[PDB]
C-alpha cells in the first residue's frame, strides 16, 4: 500500500509552531512514521518553500516528503495559496507522472489540500481520505469561500476523518455531512519523549533552561497567533502580580509568531520570558520545567499540546474549547476555565500554583492520562480506515 | 480540430456590462463563433452560474458552451474563485470523460482560466494558448497573487496570444516573456451590426429612445465600475454646464453596474439618462444617437466599445490608455485625453460639441476605420495560431 499524504500549504519538516506549522504537521508527520514503520508506504506532498531540501526527502524508510515547486518560494501567505491550487495539484501530476509512481488512497490535510485530493482522486480513481483540521463554520467572503469548500469536501470525500467525536458533531451539524462517512481517529502524543520523567528531571530541565529552581513556573507552548491566547495568560498573570506583587511566579513562552510589547505595557517583563521555538527533543525540559502549562486557546482541535503536557507529568489548565476538554481529565489531570477573562484564569492559576499537594497529584494522574493515546495506535486505526476504503471502491 | 476554450470566472453568454462581463466575453464569444463557420469545433467551458441553462448549451453549429458546477450557483465573486480552481478543473475532467470529448488544443482567457488550463494541457498532451485580456502588473497581496499566476502562465503557455502590440511590450517588460512565444491576434468587432446606417437612422434611433432629436448627445456604454471613468463622464459633463448652464446636451449612460447619485450632488441629473444594459442588437440605437462616444477608462485593453463607436459612425473621446490609441486614430476619427481630469474632458467635449464640421466628418471617417476589425479575420488569425501549435507541438 502507497498513500499520499497532501499538506499543501505547510509542509511537515517546519519547526512548529512558529510560522503556519503546529499539531497539524507534527500528527502529519507522526503518522506518517508509524504508518512507515507498519509496512504502509507514505509520500507527503507539500508545496516547496525551502529550495537546499530539493525535491524528494528520504524521512525514514517508507517516508518521503515531495517538495512540489507551485509559485514563488516565498511571499505568498495562506491567505492567498488557493490562487496556487491548480499548480500544485500540476506539480503533483507530473512528479508521480516523471517518477512513475503510483498511489492507493489519498488522505488529504485541510482544506487547501482537500480540493487537491479531490480532483486527484477523481482522475487516480482511488479513495479520498480528508482530515479538515479546523473549519470555517466553527465572517468575510475569504471564509464563506473556505466554508463552500469544506462543505465540498464533505459531500465528496470517501472518509470524513475526524479527531475527535466533538468534531463529528461539528460535520454533521455545520456541513450536514452523512455519519455514514465520518470516522473517529483518535489522535497520539510522543508519550515516550514527553515524560516526567526521573526524580531530578525537573530540576535538570531548570538548570537547562536557566530558570531558578526554587519558583513558580507557568509555561505556554505553541504559535503566538492571537486565537491562541498567549496574551489571555500574559493579562492573567499581571492579575496575579496586582493580587499579590511578590508572588514567587515565573513564565516561560515558548516560541514563535510584540507579546513583550504587551508584557512591558503591563509590567511584567521581568518575571516573562520567551523562548524560540525548538525540536521536540528539546521542548521536553520546557514541559518538564514547568508547574503548570497554560494552554487559553480561542480555537481547537485536538488539543495536542495539552496532551504533550500531560504525557511530561505537568498539569494543565486550559479553555473549554476544541478537544481541550477530552485531552485534559478535567478536575483529575488540570483545570477547564470558561472564557478567557484575566479574572478567570488568575484565579485557576491561583487555585493550581497555592494548593501544592492537588497539583502534585494532577501531574502524577496525567502521565496514566496522556498513556491512552499513542501516534501507534493512531496509525493502526488509519491503517484499518485504509483498508476498509480500499476494500469498498 | 476541437478547441476547448476556457471562460472559468465569466460565461460568453452573460450579457455583457453589467456584472463581471464585458469586451472579454464578446471576445471569446465572437471568435468562437467564426470559428465555428470555419469548420472548427468549439466548446467554450465556464463555471455554471445559472442552472436553468443545463450542463451544455448548443449556441450554433460546432459551438457550445459548457457550463459546469464548482461551488455555489451565487455568493462567490471573482476575487474568490480562486478557492474554487481544483473543483472547476475537476469539474472539466469529469465532463469530458463523461461524454468522451477529445480536444486538439486549449485557448484559455485570464488567469484563472489559464491556470486551469495549464494543468489541463500537461495532463491531455494538447498545446495551450493563453489570453491575459488584463494583468496586474499593468498593490495588495492578492494582486501579487495573480501577478504570480500572471507570471506562470507567461513562462508555460505554448502562445501568449496578445491582443496589440502594445500588450505584447507588456508581456516582455512586466512579465519577462520570451517574444518567440507572443502572437498578435488583432481583435475585431461587428461591423455589420454597429453600423451607421442609413441617412435616417440616427433620428429613427433617438426617436426608438425617446431622445430629443434636436439636442447633442454624448454617451457612455459599458460596465458602471469606477476603472471605466463614467464618473469622469458625469463631472466633465457638470463641468460644461458650469460654463454654459443652457448647453444644449444630453448624456446617455448604458448601462450596469450610485452614479445617479453622484450626478444629483453636482446639478445634472436632469439632463443624464441611465440606460439598462442591453444585448448588442438594442445598443446599436444607443451609438447610432450619440454624437460623441466618450470612453475615459482608467485601464484597458484593447478598445471594444471605441471600436463599436466608430463602426456605427460616431466620433469616440478616448483615453490615452490600453488599446485605445490604436482603437482610435487620433485627430481623424475622434480624440484622446491625457489624465482624467474633469477639465480636460470638457475641453475636448466641448470641442466636439461645437464643431459640427470636424465631427460629423470624424464620424465618416470612423466607419472606414472601424473597418479594419472584423471578428473573421480576427478568427483566421487564431485558424493559424492553432494549426502551428498543433504542428510543433
Ligand atoms: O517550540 C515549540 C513549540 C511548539 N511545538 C509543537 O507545536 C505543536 C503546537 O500544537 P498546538 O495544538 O497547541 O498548535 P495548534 O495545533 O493549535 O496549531 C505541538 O505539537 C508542539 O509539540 C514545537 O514543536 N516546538
Ligand atoms: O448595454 C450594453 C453595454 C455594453 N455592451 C458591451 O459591453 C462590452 C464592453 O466593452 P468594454 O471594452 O468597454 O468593457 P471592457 O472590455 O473594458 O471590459 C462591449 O462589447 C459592448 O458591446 C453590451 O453588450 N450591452
Ligand atoms: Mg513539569
Ligand atoms: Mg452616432
Chains 1, 2 share one sequence.
Not at 520523567?197 to 509555561?219: C, F, M
Not at 511584567?268 to 521536553?284: A, G, M, Y
Not at 491561583?350 to 499537594?357: C, G, I, M, Q
Request: charged fraction near 25%; hydrophobic fraction near 40%.
Amino acid at each position: 500500500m502507497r498513500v499520499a499524504m497532501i499538506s499543501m500549504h505547510t509542509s511537515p519538516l517546519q519547526q512548529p509552531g512558529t510560522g503556519d506549522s503546529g499539531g497539524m504537521n507534527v500528527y502529519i508527520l507522526s503518522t506518517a512514521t508509524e504508518l512507515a514503520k507498519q509496512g504502509i508506504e507514505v509520500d507527503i506532498y507539500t508545496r516547496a518553500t525551502r529550495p537546499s531540501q530539493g525535491e524528494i526527502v528520504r524521512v525514514a524508510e517508507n517516508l518521503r516528503v515531495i517538495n512540489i515547486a507551485a509559485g514563488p518560494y516565498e511571499g505568498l501567505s495562506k491567505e492567498e495559496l488557493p490562487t496556487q491550487l491548480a499548480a500544485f495539484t500540476g506539480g503533483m501530476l507530473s512528479f508521480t507522472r516523471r517518477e512513475k509512481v503510483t498511489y492507493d488512497l489519498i488522505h488529504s490535510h485541510y482544506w487547501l489540500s482537500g480540493q487537491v485530493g479531490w480532483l486527484l482522486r477523481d482522475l487516480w480513481r482511488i479513495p479520498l481520505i480528508h482530515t479538515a483540521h479546523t473549519l470555517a463554520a466553527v465572517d468575510t467572503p475569504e471564509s464563506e469561500a473556505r466554508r463552500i469548500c469544506e462543505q465540498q469536501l464533505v459531500d465528496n470525500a470517501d472518509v470524513l476523518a475526524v479527531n475527535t467525536q466533538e468534531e463529528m458533531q461539528d460535520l454533521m451539524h455545520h456541513y450536514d455531512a452523512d455519519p455514514d462517512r465520518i470516522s473517529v481517529v483518535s489522535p497520539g502524543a510522543d508519550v515516550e519523549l514527553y515524560s516526567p520523567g526521573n526524580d531530578r528531571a525537573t530540576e535538570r530541565s531548570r538548570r537547562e533552561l536557566g530558570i531558578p529552581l526554587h519558583t513558580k513556573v507557568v509555561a505556554f507552548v505553541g504559535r503566538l497567533q492571537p486565537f491562541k491566547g498567549p496574551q489571555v495568560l500574559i493579562k492573567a498573570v499581571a492579575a496575579l502580580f496586582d493580587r499579590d506583587p511578590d508572588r514567587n511566579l515565573r513564565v516561560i513562552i515558548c516560541g514563535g509568531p510584540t507579546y513583550r510589547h504587551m508584557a512591558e505595557e503591563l509590567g511584567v517583563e521581568k518575571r516573562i520570558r520567551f523562548l524560540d521555538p525548538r525540536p521536540p527533543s528539546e521542548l521536553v525540559a520546557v514541559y518538564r520545567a514547568a508547574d503548570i502549562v497554560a494552554v487559553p486557546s480561542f480555537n481547537e482541535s485536538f488539543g495536542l499540546v495539552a496532551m504533550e503536557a500531560q504525557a511530561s507529568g505537568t498539569p494543565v489548565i486550559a479553555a473549554r474549547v476544541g478537544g481541550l476538554p477530552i485531552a485534559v481529565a478535567e478536575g483529575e489531570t488540570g483545570l477547564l476555565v470558561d472564557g478567557h477573562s484575566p479574572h478567570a484564569w488568575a484565579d485557576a492559576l491561583a487555585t493550581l500554583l497555592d494548593d501544592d499537594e492537588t497539583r502534585i497529584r494532577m501531574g502524577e494522574d496525567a502521565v496514566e492520562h496522556a498513556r491512552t493515546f499513542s501516534w501507534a495506535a493512531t496509525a493502526a486505526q488509519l491503517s484499518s480506515l485504509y483498508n476498509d476504503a480500499i476494500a469498498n471502491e
